[PDB]
Symmetry: D2
Subunit: 333 residues, 4 copies
Amino acid sequence: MVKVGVNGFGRIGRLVTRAAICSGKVEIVAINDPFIDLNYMVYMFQYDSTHGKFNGTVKAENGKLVINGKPITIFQERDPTNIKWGEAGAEYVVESTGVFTTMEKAGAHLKGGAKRVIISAPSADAPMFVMGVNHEKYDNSLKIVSNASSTTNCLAPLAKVIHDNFGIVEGLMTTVHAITATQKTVDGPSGKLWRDGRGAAQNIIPASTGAAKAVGKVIPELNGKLTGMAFRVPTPNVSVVDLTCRLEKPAKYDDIKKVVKQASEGPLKGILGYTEDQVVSCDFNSNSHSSTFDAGAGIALNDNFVKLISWYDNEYGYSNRVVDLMAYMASKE
Amino acid sequence: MVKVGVNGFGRIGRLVTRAAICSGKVEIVAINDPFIDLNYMVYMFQYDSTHGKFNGTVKAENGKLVINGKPITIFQERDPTNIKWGEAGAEYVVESTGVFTTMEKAGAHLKGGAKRVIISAPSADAPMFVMGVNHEKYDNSLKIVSNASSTTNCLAPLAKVIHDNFGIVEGLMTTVHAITATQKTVDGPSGKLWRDGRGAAQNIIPASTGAAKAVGKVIPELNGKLTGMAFRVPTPNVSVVDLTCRLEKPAKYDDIKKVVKQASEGPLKGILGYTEDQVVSCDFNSNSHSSTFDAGAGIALNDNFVKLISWYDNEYGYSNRVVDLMAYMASKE
Amino acid sequence: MVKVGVNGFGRIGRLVTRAAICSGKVEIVAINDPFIDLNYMVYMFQYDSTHGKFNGTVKAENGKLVINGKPITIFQERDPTNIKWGEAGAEYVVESTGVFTTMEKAGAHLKGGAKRVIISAPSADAPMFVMGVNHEKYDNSLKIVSNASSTTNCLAPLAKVIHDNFGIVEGLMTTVHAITATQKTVDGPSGKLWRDGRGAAQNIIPASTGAAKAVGKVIPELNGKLTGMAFRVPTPNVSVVDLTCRLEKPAKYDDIKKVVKQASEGPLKGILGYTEDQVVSCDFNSNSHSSTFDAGAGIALNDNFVKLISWYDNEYGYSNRVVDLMAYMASKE
Amino acid sequence: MVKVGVNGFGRIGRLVTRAAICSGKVEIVAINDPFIDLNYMVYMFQYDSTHGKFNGTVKAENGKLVINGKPITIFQERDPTNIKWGEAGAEYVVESTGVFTTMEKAGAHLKGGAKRVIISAPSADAPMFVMGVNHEKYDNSLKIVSNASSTTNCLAPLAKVIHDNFGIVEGLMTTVHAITATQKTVDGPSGKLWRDGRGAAQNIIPASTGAAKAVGKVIPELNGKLTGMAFRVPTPNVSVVDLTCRLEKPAKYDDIKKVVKQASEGPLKGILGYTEDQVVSCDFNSNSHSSTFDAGAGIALNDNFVKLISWYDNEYGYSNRVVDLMAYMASKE
Ligand SMILES: NC(=O)c1ccc[n+]([C@@H]2O[C@H](COP(=O)([O-])OP(=O)(O)OC[C@H]3O[C@@H](n4cnc5c(N)ncnc54)[C@H](O)[C@@H]3O)[C@@H](O)[C@H]2O)c1
Ligand SMILES: NC(=O)c1ccc[n+]([C@@H]2O[C@H](COP(=O)([O-])OP(=O)(O)OC[C@H]3O[C@@H](n4cnc5c(N)ncnc54)[C@H](O)[C@@H]3O)[C@@H](O)[C@H]2O)c1
Ligand SMILES: NC(=O)c1ccc[n+]([C@@H]2O[C@H](COP(=O)([O-])OP(=O)(O)OC[C@H]3O[C@@H](n4cnc5c(N)ncnc54)[C@H](O)[C@@H]3O)[C@@H](O)[C@H]2O)c1
């Protein structure tokens, strides 16, 4: 089983740690975050406004973070080249600071002894993967990879099923997306474009989504045929993809539901979900799926033009996919 | 000025009264609401969480509501049949309770002496109108009419400009829509619309939009070619239309911007607006336009497939249009 | 266990059911709610925006609501005198509609064969109880009782400990209180509680609290020496009491902490909690305590004048006390 | 009009600018911010989620910010010591960044040619003034002064009136305070103030504040007799002071209302307001008062122990007092 270091103990860093504990699929052995000391990590891991108090034990002892009795080595390095991953036994590093998303920057972790780096965001040049969609294109020569974004992990499984069965001629999508840590509590200086500095709990905010440029990398057959944007809205977690697409082969809405349900029970089980219930965003809080198709909420204008809806816990579904990708990579070693 | 009675002194009834009173296009002379007594009406009209305190005077005197010195007769009838509109001199009645939206129910106001009724919502059977789109189809034999919905009033002027210039082959739309009075503060009963009962400020909620069935009636050439749905999100006011459509004639995005800007400066001035600024929803609070095209937020996938974004103050833009529709109707008497 | 019927399957009615299942202390055998039909009850019990999806099974079968394989009789009566509690085997009825809080109205359930009634709110005339404070004043003659309110259940255990140990000369309190079902999503009619109709997600709203008139009944030595009010603020659940009191015997703040912690570990265990952690409201979501003293948040002006802070899940803590009171009542039978 | 430079174009700097233009009591001639370029300043000043779009013109021309046709010199200096206030004609400098609140640090603006510095925040060592309470203690030898905090400006005028008439023996205050820029959209790192990092729109968050202690310094006779704390709650603006105090002379609540109303109509006009209306927080958005007594929300436990409630727009009331303090200082030159 692969031993993991986490760089950036944030929303994703902490929920990747929870997912690793919940799934047992990888082992966290080290965490680096210069803004959160050991005692502070006890607090921030234990209490979570969105996902609730951790169901387990967490304490600081002998300089280590001890979760369910397992000690974790804690680093406090602002410069990732200074992190002694090898000494702590960290083989794979989750790069979840938000600020080292290029090959050049994320590769810093290789200097301290990490064997592979998984960027928890889209990358300008690291190869990007979505479990269930193109993870089989990974190979042992890729020491630096990206798990794309949470919107990309919601859109791409749904797009793949629809394209495989009916053929997407062209499509546009929107994600109605929960607020995130890059946004501001009140109108202030942005960090990525003017609209994104505006007060997050007051506003619907048009914004970019990583899926716009990533989906065509993860599904080359849809490059130039699909893109989209986001509206950030005042919820703390859970987002929803709104995919409007023209199909090559005619598809009754019942056939769409049928093939999506079949996919959710077979090859994409645990990745793509399917529901007909009268769900709202909070019903997906702490749901580990990448994408849950909402059959009741979609619209078929005609046999070749449809709107398809799919929910995703942008924090916890993505965090579980990070764990899944590392487990997959390790099985390939 | 036509003399106006307001049935239902709610978000729309009060803001219709504000719009009328400030901009004397019509004269409010009577108000009925059995759940808001006279002294309570003073308070509810004076203070408004969303649009600020009324800039003017409001008081109770001699059993009438006096706004900027003009006395208004106050009724407290549950049954519209029993409201003495004629005795109060009300010629047109705004039917803004939300529960009398059919011809049969809204026509009760004629029994008390009203001459015409304007339903502030879509109607299963009353003829529907959107200022700037089909209001010249009104004729004087229509005693009961509908002003459609706020989403219809945002979508239809934009769809008209796009269809007139390039031809909409097919389209689907979403409105990211502020919470309204039909929603609930915490998970509660909602009759047969189960998602609408879930806690409004906690969730993104898929929902119907009145635009879905109304837009094909106000633009008959688009009937069956355009529909959509809503996501209710935790903001108190201001909504945004996201229109994805295929065009018959190819159009560069700059060509779309040019015809929309031209429409906003000509025949649709005051109804359809145009901006290139980096706006978010709060920038439209108390904006009286029906539809403001957001040039920067849209996406062209190719010359025949686009996503177009348009903002609307669902409370205040619609309330101004109710006033405008009545002023137009009165001008044709 | 005593067999229980629930009148009003709302926030309290549903979480009383969850608390009963979690505790095993009582058995829900019947539920009445004319606004939630059988199939709708499945949905509202299964999905909860605040407390998450039910961890168990729930389905409708042969006209019963079946939770964890146990069937519950469902009634749909507006008028409580028509509910056949006796025939369904419901011995105690939880009166959680919010509209039958007097002895005369709540006594309707005895006509259908219920043996006792527990009003889930303060009552103008039914005896009121707070577990840990005055529950031993209950006796078998009381067929109609009240469990007071969630703020009373948070304030009264803390005031009891303070008063027993140091003597409360006089005090006033505030609860910063989550929004509830009586509030409105946007400015609307509230009846005679005018501030309570203002938009709940937009506003800090001064309001009454049931603790103001209840606390002097559950702690008679403090009647006229202690009262308070509320500010409703835009959170969906969890509230906090802010108790400012003058003490007869001087006490250092750490002396106060010691006696509260000692109370929390002894006779008030599970009712009064104690923490020194840097908590916020979400850390108490789904917490079954009546009152958790926040040692770090409070402040002393001097040895005889202090401000004491205590958290409470107003939904789930109160619901657990409703179950606890019924179990105590049943042990007295 | 004294000519004013603004250091820092955060919320306070921008709203001081708006207050100055709206009131015409001073003339803004220069703004320094090293993080916000001139085109971005146009945008942040023009659009405001909380207070609405600026009602006037704002443009970038010739390297200056031109508001209502009057050009403003823009600087971008990291080091206040290098800002050329004198060349721009700025006589008073509003020091609003938060990081130069000591006399040694704020005095850096004197080296660039400014004559006086007004710190828009509490200061360890500069003299602090609350208009209406102790501004008469200003004198022309004072080159560096502080305008205290918003909460101190709300509590102090109320405490002055209550102490002048009845004598405050001791008091404890809570402020229920809107979200501010120091908070985080989702749980994130907050240095040594752990609770302040928790998701702002999700949580009621206890927080320390020196404001009550500080009014014991601006009103020396209350030194040692006041302290308090805060709860941060999910609203974007407007806060409320909750003062529980013991009085030396007995006072009926009607006596309290009378002397507060008298003060608000006389010497504290525009600073201390008085209402009996059924107000909520949004009713004070963009209200320029420092403190508005809420007569209906307070409680008299007895003639010597009361809870007094007073509202404040923590952004705009304070910004207007900064302008008023500068106008007062200039009148004594
Ligand atoms: N829904 C989501 O939040 C989500 C989902 C998928 C991917 N992502 C992406 O994951 C990444 C992290 O997102 P997040 O929401 O967890 O942000 P976050 O702000 O919650 O976490 C970032 C963490 O990195 C720490 N950090 C900052 N600089 C550091 C440095 N030099 N070295 C080590 N640690 C540092 C921070 O202290 C913080 O704890 C981003 O790339 C983001 O866009 C976010
Ligand atoms: N954004 C909006 O809020 C919006 C926009 C456009 C159209 N509309 C439509 O306007 C109508 C009212 O919407 P609203 O948002 O103002 O709702 P609201 O709940 O704020 O107002 C409804 C008013 O009707 C009163 N009322 C209820 N029953 C009545 C009766 N028998 N007789 C007289 N008055 C009665 C109520 O007391 C209330 O004041 C609905 O049809 C709605 O879909 C709403
Ligand atoms: N935090 C809280 O929510 C809280 C805490 C303690 C006590 N309480 C009190 O509990 C009671 C219910 O509060 P709630 O928050 O659960 O409100 P709610 O609106 O969520 O629940 C009320 C339920 O009663 C149903 N109902 C209405 N009329 C009925 C009738 N004639 N017969 C049967 N059922 C009917 C409604 O359909 C609804 O499902 C109130 O008295 C309340 O003040 C609430």
